[PDB]
C-alpha cells in the first residue's frame, strides 16, 4: 500500500509568516495529491487538488507545488482563521485512498514554564478499591513536555494515560493531565508517588512528590 | 449550496447491524457518486465507500469489504449505508461526501456535518462524582466524573455561576470500556474555607444529575 | 455635600458595553453568602460621591 508521511508533525508560527508543508509518498505519484484543511472538530474542507489547483472559492494565499513523491503547500502569509490540521491524501491509487498523517499549525508565542500539581487519591476512590494519582502540568508552551512517574524512586510506564487540551485562546498555553491508575493493593505497597516534568521552559526537571499517608 | 445531513448513528453492541441516512439537498444527487468516510475519536480520516450515480457500483474499503453495504435511492434523493456485523473498530463519525466528477480520480468537494456510531459491549451506566479538593498563590479544585457511559457528560460549576477559570478535559475510554472525566477550577487561596463550591454533572443517557460538594482537605 | 450623585462600587463582574445595571443586591465582597442582609463582608454597591 502507499503510505504519506507528511512533516512536519506540528510546527509554530506567527500571522504573516510564510507557511510551508511537505508531504512524501512511498511511491510515485503524478500530480494526484492533494490538501485538506480541518478545524478542531469541524468537518475537513478541500483546499488544493491535482496538487497544483486551488479550490474555489479558498483564498489565494495557498499555493500546492510538486510531483511525483514530494509535494508541498505553501501559504504566503498566515491568517489566525488558518491555524488547523492540514492532510495530504494521494489520489493515485482510487481504490486504496489514504491520507497524510497531518502537520498542526499551532500560534507561535514565548516559552511557558509549566505549573505542576500533584493530587493523591481521593479517600472515596479508596473505599471502591482503585486508586488514582493526578499529575497536572498547567499553562505551558510548547505542548512538548516530558511527564513521568516514580514510585520508590522507581520508573512507571504504562501505568497512567495522559490527556493534553488544545492551545489555550487567551494565553495559547497547553495544560496535560496524567492519571496514574492502579489497585489499592498496589497503592500501600508503595510509599513515595512522585511525577517528574521536563520541559523547554525548565532548566532541570521539576519534582513534585508526595508520601502516602502524610498530608 | 448544498446541504447534505447525516442521521441514524448511535450506541449498538459488536456484531449488531446500523442503518445510516444521507439526505442531500440542493443539487443533483443521482449524476454524482457518493463517498463513505469515517473518521475516529482522535483519529485521522478513512475512506470507507463509494456508490455511483446510478447506484449500480459498489465499492468499499478492504477493512469494511464483505462486511457493509451502500445503496442509493435517486427517487428520494437519500444514501443508505447498512452496517452489519459492526466491530468496536466501527466507532467513528461517519460523513457523505459529493464527488464532483472534475477529475478522473475520486476528490472530495464537501462534507457534511456526519453522525456519530459507537460500538460497545457496556450497558448505560451512572457517573460516579468524586472530589478533588485543594491544599495550602492561588488553588486549584475540581470533580472527578469516573465510570460513566456512553457520552456525553455535562459539567458545571456553581450551576454555571462559576465559568471563568474552568477546565473540563476531553473524556478518556478506560480499559474497563467506561469513560473517565476530570473538572478543573482555580480559585484564589483566600477563598478557600467558607466559599461552597459544587459540581453539577448531568448524564441523559443514563439520566444522573449529581451535585459533588469540593472542600478543602482536612488533616 | 451633595449626595444625590451615586455610582457602583462592587460587581461580581464587568458590564458589557452600553450595559444599564441598576440592581441593589448586596454584594458579597466576601465569600460568606449574605442573604440581603449587610455586616461583614456584606456591602451595599452604591456609594454616594462627596
Known amino acids: 500500500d502507499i503510505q504519506m508521511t507528511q512533516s512536519p508533525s506540528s510546527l509554530s508560527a506567527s500571522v504573516g509568516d510564510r507557511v510551508t508543508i511537505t508531504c512524501r509518498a512511498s511511491?510515485?505519484?503524478?500530480?494526484?495529491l492533494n490538501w485538506y484543511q480541518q478545524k478542531p472538530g469541524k468537518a475537513p474542507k478541500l483546499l488544493i487538488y491535482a496538487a497544483s489547483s486551488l479550490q474555489s472559492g479558498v483564498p489565494s494565499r495557498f499555493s500546492g507545488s510538486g510531483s511525483g513523491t514530494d509535494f508541498t503547500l505553501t501559504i504566503s502569509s498566515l491568517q489566525p482563521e488558518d491555524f488547523a490540521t492540514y492532510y495530504c491524501?494521494?489520489?493515485?491509487?482510487?481504490?486504496?485512498?489514504?491520507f497524510g498523517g497531518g502537520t498542526k499549525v499551532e500560534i507561535k508565542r514565548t516559552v511557558a514554564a509549566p505549573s505542576v500539581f500533584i493530587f493523591p487519591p481521593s479517600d472515596e476512590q479508596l473505599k471502591s478499591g482503585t486508586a488514582s494519582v493526578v499529575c497536572l502540568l498547567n499553562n505551558f508552551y510548547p505542548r512538548e513536555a516530558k511527564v513521568q512517574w516514580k514510585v520508590d524512586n522507581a520508573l512507571q510506564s504504562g501505568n497512567s494515560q495522559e490527556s493534553v487540551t488544545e492551545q489555550d485562546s487567551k494565553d495559547s498555553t497547553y495544560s496535560l493531565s496524567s492519571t496514574l491508575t492502579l489497585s489499592k493493593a498496589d497503592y500501600e505497597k508503595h510509599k513515595v508517588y512522585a511525577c517528574e516534568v521536563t520541559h523547554q521552559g525548565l532548566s532541570s526537571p521539576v519534582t513534585k512528590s508526595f508520601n502516602r499517608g502524610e498530608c | 449550496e448544498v446541504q447534505l445531513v447525516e442521521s441514524g448513528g448511535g450506541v449498538v453492541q459488536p456484531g449488531r447491524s446500523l442503518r445510516l441516512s444521507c439526505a442531500a439537498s440542493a443539487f443533483t444527487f443521482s449524476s454524482y457518486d457518493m463517498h463513505w468516510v469515517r473518521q475516529a475519536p482522535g483519529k485521522g480520516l478513512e475512506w470507507v465507500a463509494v456508490?455511483?450515480?446510478?447506484?449500480?457500483?459498489?465499492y468499499y474499503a478492504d477493512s469494511v469489504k464483505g462486511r457493509f453495504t451502500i445503496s442509493r435511492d435517486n427517487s428520494k434523493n437519500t444514501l443508505y449505508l447498512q452496517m452489519n456485523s459492526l466491530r468496536a473498530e466501527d466507532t467513528a463519525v461517519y460523513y457523505c461526501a459529493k464527488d464532483g466528477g472534475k477529475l478522473w480520480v475520486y476528490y472530495f468537494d464537501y462534507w457534511g456535518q456526519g453522525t456519530l456510531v459507537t460500538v460497545s459491549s457496556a450497558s448505560t451506566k451512572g457517573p460516579s462524582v468524586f472530589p478533588l479538593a485543594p491544599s495550602s498563590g492561588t488553588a486549584a479544585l475540581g470533580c472527578l466524573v469516573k465510570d460513566y457511559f456512553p457520552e456525553p457528560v455535562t459539567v458545571s460549576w456553581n450551576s454555571g455561576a462559576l465559568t471563568s477559570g474552568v477546565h473540563t478535559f476531553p473524556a478518556v475510554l478506560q480499559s474497563s470500556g467506561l469513560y473517565s472525566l476530570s473538572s478543573v477550577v482555580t480559585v484564589p487561596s483566600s477563598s478557600l474555607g467558607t466559599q461552597t463550591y459544587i459540581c453539577n454533572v448531568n448524564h441523559k443517557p443514563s439520566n444522573t444529575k449529581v451535585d459533588k460538594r469540593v472542600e478543602p482537605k482536612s488533616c | 455635600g451633595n449626595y444625590n450623585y451615586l455610582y457602583r462600587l462592587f460587581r461580581k463582574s464587568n458590564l458589557k458595553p452600553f450595559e444599564r445595571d441598576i440592581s441593589t443586591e448586596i454584594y458579597q465582597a466576601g465569600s460568606t453568602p449574605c442573604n440581603g442582609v449587610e455586616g461583614f463582608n456584606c456591602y451595599f454597591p452604591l456609594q454616594s460621591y462627596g
Open positions: 456508490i455511483s450515480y446510478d447506484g449500480s457500483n459498489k
Open positions: 511511491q510515485s505519484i503524478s500530480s494526484y
Open positions: 491524501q494521494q489520489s493515485y491509487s482510487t481504490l486504496a485512498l489514504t
